Amino acid sequence: RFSHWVKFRMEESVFAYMKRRSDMGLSMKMSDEDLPVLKSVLMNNPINIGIRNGGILTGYDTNKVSY
Amino acid sequence: NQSKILTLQAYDPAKVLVFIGGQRVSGFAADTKIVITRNNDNISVHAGVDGEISNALSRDNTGVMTLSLQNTAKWNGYLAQWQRQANVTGLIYLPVQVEGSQGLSLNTIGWIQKQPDLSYGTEVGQMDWEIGVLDAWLSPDQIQGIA
Amino acid sequence: NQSKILTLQAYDPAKVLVFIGGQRVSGFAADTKIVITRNNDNISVHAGVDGEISNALSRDNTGVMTLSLQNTAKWNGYLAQWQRQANVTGLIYLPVQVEGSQGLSLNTIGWIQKQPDLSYGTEVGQMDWEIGVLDAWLSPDQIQGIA
Amino acid sequence: NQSKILTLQAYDPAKVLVFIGGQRVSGFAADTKIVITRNNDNISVHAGVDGEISNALSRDNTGVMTLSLQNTAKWNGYLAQWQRQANVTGLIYLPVQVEGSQGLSLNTIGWIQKQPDLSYGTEVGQMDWEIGVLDAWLSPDQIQGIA
Amino acid sequence: NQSKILTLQAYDPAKVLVFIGGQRVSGFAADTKIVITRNNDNISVHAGVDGEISNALSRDNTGVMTLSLQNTAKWNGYLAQWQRQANVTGLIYLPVQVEGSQGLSLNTIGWIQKQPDLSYGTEVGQMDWEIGVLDAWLSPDQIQGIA
Amino acid sequence: NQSKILTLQAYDPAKVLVFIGGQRVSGFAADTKIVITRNNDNISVHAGVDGEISNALSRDNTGVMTLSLQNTAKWNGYLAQWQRQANVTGLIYLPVQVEGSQGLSLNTIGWIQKQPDLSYGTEVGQMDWEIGVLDAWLSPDQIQGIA
Amino acid sequence: NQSKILTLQAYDPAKVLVFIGGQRVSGFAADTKIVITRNNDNISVHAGVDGEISNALSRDNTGVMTLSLQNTAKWNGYLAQWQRQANVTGLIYLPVQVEGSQGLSLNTIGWIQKQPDLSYGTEVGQMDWEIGVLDAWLSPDQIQGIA
């Protein structure tokens, strides 16, 4: 269920931003100066709600690597 | 000496991208583009009479980010609208992101803390918007070879 | 580069209009015409011991506006009369307006907060009148394309 | 542009007359002749929690006037005698008047508030006498056309 | 203009005599010889709520006098001995006098308030002795024509 | 004079080694490499009414060390990772060492006290990391002939 | 004028001797060698309401002495060892002496009050050691003719 929810909401969140950004003209473009914003787009909708609700884990381990 | 060149590609300031709310900022000032600071130091030291030392970890990591824009820039309009939006509706937060071309990045949420001082004269002025950022841990992700 | 011209029409400082009480101000100083500031920041942050964060919306939006005039200007007379008028009769408020030629505007009411320092010497002096403005939200209305 | 000449007669600093006690002052310093200031701002603002705003009118209008004189001037003698006169007899007040050649005037009573710092060196020094003025409302009377 | 010559005899700084304890001081510094100041202003103003004004006459007239001497001067010895003299025996006071060549004089008693900062370097230093003067009313006696 | 040459071998700044955690630091700024300070003076003096003097020995010897690095340096990454490491896991301390080429050394443990102010502009910036050092007694060990 | 030559023998800064603990100091900085100051002024003045004046003699005469040394100097080692010596064993005091070539001398005991700020850069640095001196009465003994 968690995997299905993450998949659906990631697709939803990317599509909604892309369409809204293409409806004012100024459609997204494949360039190094425009692609990074997907980091915020993804970090916003699914991930920052999963962390708050506690489904997604965070912190540091011992494996000696961050979660 | 050429054996200690710290940057093999010249540092181009235009590579530094800033996204607020998902739109790329533009129209910056003359000398400095951004400044990122913390408010509180990392740990607190409580030293006893005889030299016993104990330390504490801070839990307030908020910082402040300054954004210099020419007062003729168009982005002054977007921030000015946003202030009134939040003052009435009560929605203040907004995603913030920074790209460390050859330095440290940043990716968090923030809000407009104060509005700058608008001045008109014989030269095109300047504005220093304060975007308080909720969490201000700098990220080394842009650097390669960090083991 | 010519693909990043931030102003296609040169910024002419004479387009900046200021109306106080319905009459157009004139007789300004050498370098700066006006400066607009707030007194209080927009929101207050109350952070708990364990990191719980909560925010509050300010309700004091008053600001201060400085108006530089040559001490030989005629408008010094109108402001000087107005001070005594309000001190006795008790009517202080007066409409204030600003035109952001290629920037942010302002339209509110204000009053004379303090009188400047009058000095006489070998050069024509200067005066900095303080016109406290009741509400200081800058308006982007002059800018086109604000969606 | 010649259509915005703010003064059709050159501002001659020698027209600024100052009378203390009925005698004309003379023997001034190099750069600045006088400076007039207030101590308190005009009104007080008491803003409530929810934004209710109410204002109060000040009732302390005293100001301070500085008078720069070369330490070789003869008028230093008259002020120095006056200090001792008032310290013993208890009569401090004395009429004060100022003529705003092309600016704001002043006409009130005042007293010597403090004595300056006397210094002797390789150049003729300077003295800054403080003449506290009981009431410091500037007068536009010298200006014509004030409707 | 030659009709406003404020001094018909050039001001010669060497005419300024200073006597402490009855011996003439000598060995002064490069720029400033002396500085005389008061500590308290002349009168106190107590203004009421509704504008009632009343004034008070001060009764502390003590001042401070600074005396610049080259650290190679011989008079540094006399002052240094005097400090220890008073610290043990308890006799501090000593007559002080000043001659206002073309200015204001002074004639009172005083004591050494503090000792300066002695510094040695590549240039002949300087010392600023503080001679607290019991009463600091400047005298116009040197000026003629004071009616 | 050649009989007072204080250094027979020129002082080469590159000999000054700094090791944090066992790795050699590199990528320093333009003018100053490091600065070491204490927080508290060595002893406390308690002087009585009649001149009785007694002294106390301090027991807080902590100091602060500043480390200037160009913001394009790679070592900014290692420190930035370390901050988060300690904030979560609670392990803050880390060995610190300094080599006094022709001066005083240092060898103790320390932690990152605060993070600097990151600024981006037309020139390669700078960063001032604060490495609080637990004990800050400078060591003369590099100097020969210390009897 | 040649009749007022204040020093018939040029002031040679190298004649100023400083002995700490019985060994002659050497390795000084570029501009200033030493600075001697007091902490408290000589007497206290208690003035009554009606002008009654009474004075008190101080009993705290401690001062501070600064000693500028190039950071490459060898004497930095001796002071650094001395700090640890006193911190553990508790013996802090040490004789101090100064020779006033053509000025005021000094002869008392003192201790190291604080350690300076050690900095490494592209130029040979500097250090300002603070040698608190128990009693700081300057002595005119070097001057002849003091009756």
CSV table of C-alpha atoms in Angstrom, one decimal, chain G:
chain,number,residue,atom,x,y,z
G,1,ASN,CA,63.6,78.2,18.1
G,2,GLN,CA,66.9,76.7,19.3
G,3,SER,CA,66.4,78.2,22.8
G,4,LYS,CA,63.7,75.7,23.6
G,5,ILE,CA,65.3,72.4,22.7
G,6,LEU,CA,63.6,69.9,25.0
G,7,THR,CA,66.2,67.2,24.5
G,8,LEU,CA,69.8,67.9,24.0
G,9,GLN,CA,70.5,64.2,23.3
G,10,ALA,CA,68.3,62.5,20.8
G,11,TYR,CA,65.9,60.0,22.3
G,12,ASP,CA,67.2,56.6,21.4
G,13,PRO,CA,64.4,53.9,21.9
G,14,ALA,CA,67.0,51.2,22.4
G,15,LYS,CA,68.0,52.6,25.8
G,16,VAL,CA,64.6,51.6,27.2
G,17,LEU,CA,65.4,48.4,29.2
G,18,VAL,CA,62.8,45.9,30.4
G,19,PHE,CA,63.7,43.2,32.9
G,20,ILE,CA,61.1,40.5,33.8
G,21,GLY,CA,62.3,37.9,36.4
G,22,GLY,CA,65.8,39.2,36.1
G,23,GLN,CA,66.3,38.5,32.3
G,24,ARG,CA,66.3,41.3,29.8
G,25,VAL,CA,63.4,41.2,27.3
G,26,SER,CA,64.1,41.4,23.6
G,27,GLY,CA,62.3,40.9,20.3
G,28,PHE,CA,59.9,43.7,20.2
G,29,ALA,CA,57.3,44.7,17.6
G,30,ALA,CA,57.2,47.5,15.0
G,31,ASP,CA,55.7,50.6,16.5
G,32,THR,CA,55.0,50.5,20.2
G,33,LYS,CA,57.1,48.7,22.8
G,34,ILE,CA,55.1,49.1,26.0
G,35,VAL,CA,52.0,50.8,27.4
G,36,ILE,CA,51.4,51.4,31.1
G,37,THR,CA,48.0,52.3,32.5
G,38,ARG,CA,46.1,52.4,35.8
G,39,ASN,CA,42.6,51.0,36.4
G,40,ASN,CA,41.3,53.5,39.0
G,41,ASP,CA,41.6,57.2,39.3
G,42,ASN,CA,43.4,58.7,42.2
G,43,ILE,CA,40.6,60.2,44.4
G,44,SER,CA,36.8,60.1,44.7
G,45,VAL,CA,34.7,63.3,45.0
G,46,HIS,CA,31.5,63.3,47.0
G,47,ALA,CA,29.6,66.6,46.5
G,48,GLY,CA,26.6,67.5,48.6
G,49,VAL,CA,23.3,69.1,47.7
G,50,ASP,CA,24.4,72.6,48.8
G,51,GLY,CA,27.9,72.3,47.4
G,52,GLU,CA,29.8,70.7,50.3
G,53,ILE,CA,32.8,68.9,48.8
G,54,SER,CA,34.8,66.1,50.3
G,55,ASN,CA,37.4,63.8,48.8
G,56,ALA,CA,38.7,60.3,49.3
G,57,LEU,CA,42.1,58.6,48.6
G,58,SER,CA,42.1,55.5,46.5
G,59,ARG,CA,43.7,52.3,47.8
G,60,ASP,CA,43.6,50.2,44.5
G,61,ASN,CA,46.7,51.1,42.5
G,62,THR,CA,47.0,48.1,40.2
G,63,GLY,CA,47.7,48.7,36.6
G,64,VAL,CA,48.2,46.8,33.3
G,65,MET,CA,51.3,46.6,31.1
G,66,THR,CA,51.2,45.6,27.5
G,67,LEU,CA,54.3,44.1,25.8
G,68,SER,CA,54.4,43.8,22.0
G,69,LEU,CA,56.6,41.0,20.7
G,70,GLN,CA,56.9,39.6,17.2
G,71,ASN,CA,55.3,36.2,17.1
G,72,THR,CA,58.7,34.7,15.9
G,73,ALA,CA,60.4,36.1,19.0
G,74,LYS,CA,62.0,33.6,21.4
G,75,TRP,CA,60.6,35.3,24.5
G,76,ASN,CA,57.2,34.0,23.6
G,77,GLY,CA,58.4,30.6,24.8
G,78,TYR,CA,59.4,31.8,28.3
G,79,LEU,CA,56.1,33.5,28.9
G,80,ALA,CA,54.1,30.4,27.6
G,81,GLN,CA,56.0,28.1,29.9
G,82,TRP,CA,55.5,30.5,32.8
G,83,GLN,CA,51.7,30.4,32.4
G,84,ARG,CA,51.4,26.7,32.9
G,85,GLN,CA,54.0,26.8,35.7
G,86,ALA,CA,51.8,29.2,37.7
G,87,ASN,CA,48.5,27.5,36.8
G,88,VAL,CA,49.5,24.3,38.5
G,89,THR,CA,52.0,25.3,41.2
G,90,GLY,CA,50.1,28.5,42.2
G,91,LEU,CA,53.2,30.8,42.2
G,92,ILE,CA,52.1,33.7,40.0
G,93,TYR,CA,54.2,36.8,41.0
G,94,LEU,CA,57.4,37.8,39.3
G,95,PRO,CA,59.6,41.0,39.6
G,96,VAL,CA,59.2,43.6,36.8
G,97,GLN,CA,61.4,46.6,36.1
G,98,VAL,CA,61.5,49.3,33.5
G,99,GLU,CA,64.2,51.9,32.6
G,100,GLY,CA,63.0,55.4,31.6
G,101,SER,CA,65.8,56.4,29.3
G,102,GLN,CA,64.6,60.0,29.3
G,103,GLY,CA,61.2,59.5,30.9
G,104,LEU,CA,59.5,57.8,33.9
G,105,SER,CA,60.7,54.4,35.2
G,106,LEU,CA,58.9,51.6,37.0
G,107,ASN,CA,59.9,48.9,39.5
G,108,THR,CA,57.3,46.5,41.0
G,109,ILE,CA,56.1,42.9,40.7
G,110,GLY,CA,53.6,41.6,38.2
G,111,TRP,CA,52.0,38.5,36.7
G,112,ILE,CA,50.7,37.4,33.3
G,113,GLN,CA,47.1,38.4,33.2
G,114,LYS,CA,46.0,37.1,29.8
G,115,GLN,CA,47.5,35.4,26.8
G,116,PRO,CA,47.3,37.2,23.4
G,117,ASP,CA,45.7,36.2,20.1
G,118,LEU,CA,48.0,34.1,18.0
G,119,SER,CA,47.5,34.5,14.3
G,120,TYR,CA,49.3,33.1,11.2
G,121,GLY,CA,49.3,34.7,7.8
G,122,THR,CA,51.4,36.0,5.0
G,123,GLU,CA,53.3,38.4,7.3
G,124,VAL,CA,55.1,37.9,10.6
G,125,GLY,CA,52.4,38.5,13.2
G,126,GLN,CA,52.5,40.2,16.6
G,127,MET,CA,51.6,39.4,20.2
G,128,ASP,CA,50.3,41.7,23.1
G,129,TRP,CA,51.1,40.1,26.4
G,130,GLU,CA,49.4,41.6,29.5
G,131,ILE,CA,51.6,41.8,32.5
G,132,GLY,CA,49.5,43.1,35.4
G,133,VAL,CA,51.7,45.1,37.7
G,134,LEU,CA,50.8,45.1,41.4
G,135,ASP,CA,51.6,48.8,42.0
G,136,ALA,CA,51.9,51.4,39.2
G,137,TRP,CA,53.4,54.6,40.5
G,138,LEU,CA,55.7,56.0,37.9
G,139,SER,CA,59.1,57.1,39.2
G,140,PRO,CA,60.9,60.3,38.1
G,141,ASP,CA,64.3,59.0,39.3
G,142,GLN,CA,65.9,59.1,35.9
G,143,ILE,CA,65.3,62.8,35.6
G,144,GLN,CA,68.0,65.1,37.1
G,145,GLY,CA,67.2,68.3,38.8
G,146,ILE,CA,64.0,67.2,40.5
G,147,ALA,CA,64.0,69.3,43.7
